[PDB]
Amino acid sequence: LNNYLHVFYYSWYGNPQFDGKYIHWNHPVLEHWDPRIAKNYPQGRHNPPDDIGSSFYPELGSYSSRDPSVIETHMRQMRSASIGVLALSWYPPDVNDENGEPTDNLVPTILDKAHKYNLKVTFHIEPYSNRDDQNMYKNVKYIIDKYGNHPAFYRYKTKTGNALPMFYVYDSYITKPEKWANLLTTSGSRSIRNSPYDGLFIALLVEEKHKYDILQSGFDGIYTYFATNGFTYGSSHQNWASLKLFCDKYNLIFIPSVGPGYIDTSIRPWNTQNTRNRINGKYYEIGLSAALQTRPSLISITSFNEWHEGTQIEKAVPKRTSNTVYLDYRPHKPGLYLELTRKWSEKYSKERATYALDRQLP
Ligand SMILES: [Mg+2]
């Protein structure tokens, strides 16, 4: 099991049996800002179980995130892929993404099941409304207080010093560097540094210029998230070497994000430019290789189960309806992306052990 391979995990799916209605599977088709364009594309809410807001279809159907055997199945697959950590998409209590319901109440279950399969759970802080340094203090405190003592709570284990909680902060650039420094620098007015709520905060880098803002803010690392090679400066493989050089200089953890493909045209029909065909694993393996070549401290996978953007490595099956041929992993099996990850996890795990200075060869 690889403690340095993280995967982004979503717990926002619901169905009639466990949630009293469908959630997320019935995603609306998103409206292009220009109405002259939007009118040429589909409109309205997908209708599960046969019509869902994904280009692929899961082996578990249009499942519920709070169905305990779904959570267990997911824990199995991750373990079997040799992924040690799930980075759980997180919104504060009684808050949600605009197309979903609250999910913080499910965290205790997920931690218990992760523990059962000896996996760890870190937190992917979403851009909730009015997120700032002040309510980020409160939420870091909350997370560490409520879940910090749980045996599946993730901490990055340094060789010396106390192991630190990790927080991936999606859309960190929305908040100005001077606000972040209140929280993340040593002498900031609401500094968590050297406090019981310290951790490793990882910022999303989109554009190259965001590098400097990230330094000024006091973040401990960067990650790139997007599965589409070429969508952002950060998500382009060719820039990964430089980002790594930058992070090395400034003592930041570089965490590249690798995906198996991308397709979101079931909810963003206009966004065909960011589609990337999986070509039977080749796209994903080009990604993993590019990540490996930078000799990173951690690698992140986008994603376990973001079905809307088609970046999932979770088991998918062929499916056809009277108007839809879903994409699938044929001619390979539903577990293809799990098997490819297991391969590359083991390779990373072996190569990574030779990075450290104490391990360096004569
Ligand atoms: Mg160091």
Q: Does residue 362 sit within a domain?
A: no
What is the sign, positive or negative, of the torsion defined by CA atoms of 71, 73, 77, 79?
positive
Write the DSSP symbol of residue 4.
T
Residue 99 and residue 305: Cα distance in Å, rounded? 16
Residue with tokens 């965290």: 107
Number of domains in the chain: 1
Rounded to the nearest angstrom, the distance between the alpha carbon of 77 and the centre of ligand 1 is 32
Distances (CA, A) of 228 to 28, 232, 277: 22, 8, 10
Rounded to the nearest angstrom, the distance between the alpha carbon of 34 and the centre of ligand 1 is 48
Residue 271 and residue 264: Cα distance in Å, rounded? 7
Two structure tokens written together for 317: 């099956």
219, 175 Cβ separation under 8 angstroms: no
Rounded to the nearest angstrom, the distance between the alpha carbon of 163 and the centre of ligand 1 is 13
Rounded to the nearest angstrom, the distance between the alpha carbon of 355 and the centre of ligand 1 is 13
- What φ, ψ does residue 203 adopt, rounded to 5°? -95, 145
SS3 content of the chain, % helix, strand, coil (to 5): 35, 15, 55
Residue 155 and residue 149: Cα distance in Å, rounded? 11
Give the three-state DSSP class for 14.
strand
Give the three-state DSSP class for 132.
coil
Rounded to the nearest angstrom, the distance between the alpha carbon of 219 and the centre of ligand 1 is 14
100, 23 Cβ separation under 8 angstroms: yes
Q: Does residue 179 sit within a domain?
A: yes
What DSSP string describes 123-153?
EEE---TT--HHHHHHHHHHHHHHHTTSTTB
Tally: H helices and E strands in the chain: 10, 9
What DSSP string describes 218-241?
T-SEEE----STTSSSTT-GGGHH
86, 1 Cβ separation under 8 angstroms: no
Write the DSSP symbol of residue 260.
S
291, 302 Cβ separation under 8 angstroms: no
Rounded to the nearest angstrom, the distance between the alpha carbon of 189 and the centre of ligand 1 is 25
Distances (CA, A) of 131 to 98, 134, 150: 15, 8, 26
Rounded to the nearest angstrom, the distance between the alpha carbon of 118 and the centre of ligand 1 is 27
Two structure tokens written together for 275: 């589609």
Rounded to the nearest angstrom, the distance between the alpha carbon of 187 and the centre of ligand 1 is 20
Which residue precedes each gap in the chain (C to N above 2.5 Å)? none
Q: How far apart are the first and last CA of the chain?
A: 29
45, 132 Cβ separation under 8 angstroms: no
Bridge partner residues of 325 (DSSP)? 320
Return all residues near 234 (Cβ < 8 A) that are at least 6 apart.
204, 205, 206, 207, 210, 222, 224, 225, 226, 243
Give the three-state DSSP class for 8.
strand
Domain hosting 192: range is 1-356
Residue with tokens 């090395």: 248
Residues in the chain: 362
What per-residue string of b and e applies to 201-221 under the rule 16 or more CB within 10 Å gives b? bbbbbbeeebbebbeebbbbb
31, 325 Cβ separation under 8 angstroms: no
311, 260 Cβ separation under 8 angstroms: yes
Residue type, 299: I
Rounded to the nearest angstrom, the distance between the alpha carbon of 92 and the centre of ligand 1 is 31
Radius of gyration over alpha carbons of the chain, in Å? 20
Residue 155 and residue 331: Cα distance in Å, rounded? 39
**What is the Cβ-side half-sphere exposure of residue 153, based on CA atoms within 13 angstroms?**
16
Rounded to the nearest angstrom, the distance between the alpha carbon of 251 and the centre of ligand 1 is 7
Give the three-state DSSP class for 354.
coil
Q: Does residue 208 sit within a domain?
A: yes
Closest CA to 46 of 259, 358, 339, 323: 323
Q: Does residue 361 sit within a domain?
A: no
Rounded to the nearest angstrom, the distance between the alpha carbon of 3 and the centre of ligand 1 is 18
Closest CA to 125 of 109, 110, 103: 103
Closest CA to 122 of 156, 92, 166: 166
Rounded to the nearest angstrom, the distance between the alpha carbon of 357 and the centre of ligand 1 is 11
